[PDB]
């Protein structure tokens, strides 16, 4: 009845608020807060019995950030296929969201691809870097931004390349944090935070 209706409304509010909170902790570099908010968001998501388009987008955003946060953790498994690395998993999520904002979407995508290779190379995982390359760059003959640059670097089998300093993990994090600032600005006035802010300054 109207009870279930209201619980769905409340759940929508909770999801939005938890995304906002997760976004802030990500931007702030507040690791413990981030993990706790992640846990809350995950449980709230599991509890949902319906999804609007905005809720699906919010879930993708949460998934995207957790994979990005785990990007250097090559022992985190985000896919059933155990070979998929966290940054590859981030890429899969990224393909499902913010495509209408093409310039920022392309920049972030490129940086994630570069770093998906970089984290392997810098660990001395040269064979894994080739395997990641084959997965994220499609047909060997197809052209994609930075692809031919990355093939050259992989083939040289060195743990360090200067190209990776210019397109570094930190560069990737900063462009992503820009997108996060956008989500923050879009969601900073969602019912729960708006209401809670009014209580605080009172």
């Amino acid at each position: 009845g109207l009870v279930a209706e209201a619980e769905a409304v409340a759940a929508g509010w909770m999801l939005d608020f938890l995304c906002l909170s997760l976004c802030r902790a990500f931007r702030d570099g507040r690791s413990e807060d981030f993990r706790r908010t992640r846990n809350s968001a995950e449980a709230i998501i599991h509890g949902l019995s319906s999804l609007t388009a905005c809720q699906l987008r919010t879930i993708y955003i949460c998934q995207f950030l957790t994979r990005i946060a785990a990007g250097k953790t090559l022992d985190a498994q985000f896919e059933n296929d155990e070979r998929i690395t966290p940054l590859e998993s981030a890429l899969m999520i990224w393909g499902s969201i913010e495509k209408e904002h093409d310039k920022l979407h392309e920049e972030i995508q490129n940086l994630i691809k570069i770093q998906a290779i970089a984290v392997c190379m810098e660990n001395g995982n040269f064979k894994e870097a080739e395997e990641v390359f084959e997965r994220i760059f499609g047909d060997p003959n197809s052209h994609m931004p930075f692809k031919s640059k990355l093939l050259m670097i992989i083939s040289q089998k060195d743990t360090f390349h200067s190209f990776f300093q210019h397109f570094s993990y930190n560069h990737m994090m900063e462009k992503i944090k820009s997108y996060v600032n956008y989500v923050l600005s879009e969601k900073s006035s969602t019912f729960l935070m708006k209401a809670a802010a009014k209580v605080v300054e009172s």
């Binding site: 992640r38 846990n39 968001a41 995950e42 998501i45 599991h46 879930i59 949460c62 998934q63 957790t66 994979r67 785990a70 953790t73 022992d75 985190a76 498994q77 985000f78 896919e79 059933n80 155990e82 966290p86």
Partner: peptide, 12 residues
């Protein structure tokens, strides 16, 4: 499936 929290790679 895996949602927000990753599986950990195990030794078995």
């Amino acid at each position: 499936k895996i949602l927000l929290t990753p599986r950990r790679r195990q030794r078995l």
